[PDB]
Amino acid sequence: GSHSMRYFFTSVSRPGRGEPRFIAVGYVDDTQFVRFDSDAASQKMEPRAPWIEQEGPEYWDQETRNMKAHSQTDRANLGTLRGYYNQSEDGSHTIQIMYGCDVGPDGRFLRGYRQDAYDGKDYIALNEDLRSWTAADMAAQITKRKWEAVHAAEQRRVYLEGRCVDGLRRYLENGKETLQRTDPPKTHMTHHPISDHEATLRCWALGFYPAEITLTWQRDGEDQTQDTELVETRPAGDGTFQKWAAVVVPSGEEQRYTCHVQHEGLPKPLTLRW
Amino acid sequence: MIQRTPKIQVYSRHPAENGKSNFLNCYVSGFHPSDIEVDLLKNGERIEKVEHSDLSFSKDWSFYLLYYTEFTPTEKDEYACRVNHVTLSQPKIVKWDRDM
Amino acid sequence: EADPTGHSY
Structure with a gap:
């Protein structure tokens, strides 16, 4: 059957109470396999499925780097959006991101996704063509113009059709005894x-x-x-x-x-x- | 921003068998923002050790979490899940019923 | 594997 890989990210500002809470989870189909939590002791990406544990130190190091980078970008973005909307520093706000890819039974790319939300509503989304964006309001239009100027869409497509697919394919083989059951x-x-x-x-x-x-x-x-x-x-x-x-x-x-x-x-x- | 109130289901991992060890679950979903208070109770008293899944969310951006604890049901012991969230005036208690 | 690329809004 067909398969999917998704990452879900949530950053929440905590005015007065230190840095935003950042939580990241990765899934293959209905099975969770990795997590990162900013309040956890490790400060590393961690395994949540047996079949990922056999990935080597360089995988864990790289995934950890990726999470720290996502965390820091979200932190700056909470500030940015607060400015675009003219919101009070007193209020708690949420950024959520999901992205991932779907493959068929032959491992071929079916479709990719990248979607961002602010306070539980659409903010900006990559369209199905992997070349254009849908901005939900006037503030998101600012981001749309910026991401157009920096060719963000091509960068997303490269990821979604490449490493997203390659990674999912490896995971499906490594964890076949449970993911393909x-x-x-x-x-x-x-x-x-x-x-x-x-x-x-x-x-x-x-x-x-x-x-x-x-x-x-x-x-x-x-x-x-x-x-x-x-x-x-x-x-x-x-x-x-x-x-x-x-x-x-x-x-x-x-x-x-x-x-x-x-x-x-x-x-x-x-x-x-x- | 619009806030959404949690949906709640309390249940066991395995069909209940008196005197046999099991897991008591409280699955909270469809809520926003993510801040939430979820306790498991035995006879009205907070169960000490309760863990929870890693925060995730659905297509409509609302969040979901599984809270759980080992338990050994009996005929007489009563279990519940107690939830508070910004959208609720006061904590909401949902009794565990072995038939649901 | 996650996407290494991040973008400011």
Whole structure:
């Protein structure tokens, strides 16, 4: 299947309370593999997946340099944006950045991304063509003009089509025993009387990977979409995911209902009946 | 800037089995700004050791975090997650229910 | 691997 690598960065100003908090995380697909935290003791990029630990000292040194540089740029940028917007020094502000690339099953480049936000709203984004920018407001237009003058877009494209792709490809091979696996959901149904005349049926999917899954309820074969409560997909804490769907049914009618579970790790979709 | 209030789910890593060691999770998502207060409680009392995932965010720029602790559920012990955030007037408590 | 290039706004 297709794969992705993403880095997510958050810097938050802390007026009166020292330097901004900087937190960086890297992902391959739904799996986190590196982190940097400015308040942590190491002051290094750190491994968060087994398969990255075998990268040598020069990898860790370089990634650490990259994080310090990102940190420092964000710090100056918090000041810059505060000036563009005429904001009070008293307020806490946030810069977030995401970038990364997607590859197909043959490792070929599908698309790249680079997007910046200020205080949780779009600020400036690289367009899909990897040659132009979308600025969200008048302040971001200043940045757009600057990044045009310094040919930032070409620099991003070089990264996104090159090292982003090369890195992801190496990671997918090195961590193939986990990144290229699919853990099918462990499924079961539970039953919870609400009264003598009603019960909840809950259809569970646990321990699955990757995160994408569909759970659907039927009554006599017909989808019950509107009546179905679906929780948001949630991390188990061990690298796998969880989800459930529930329906409220008339007591005595539980056996008319079925739950269908679809996941790429299943030989065939599963059907459950009380 | 617009602020967004956290969504909260409290649950266990594994289906609960009384007397068997497990992990208690509190997954907070869809919030902004990132500053947040998340404690895990046993019988109304703050659990001492709680850790959390590395701050990340979704497509709409809102943040998410997993907070967790080892626990050994029983019939009688009550667990909860207590969340405060700038958007909440006062802390919000969500009881752990082994059926959700 | 992260992008070594940073840019001021």
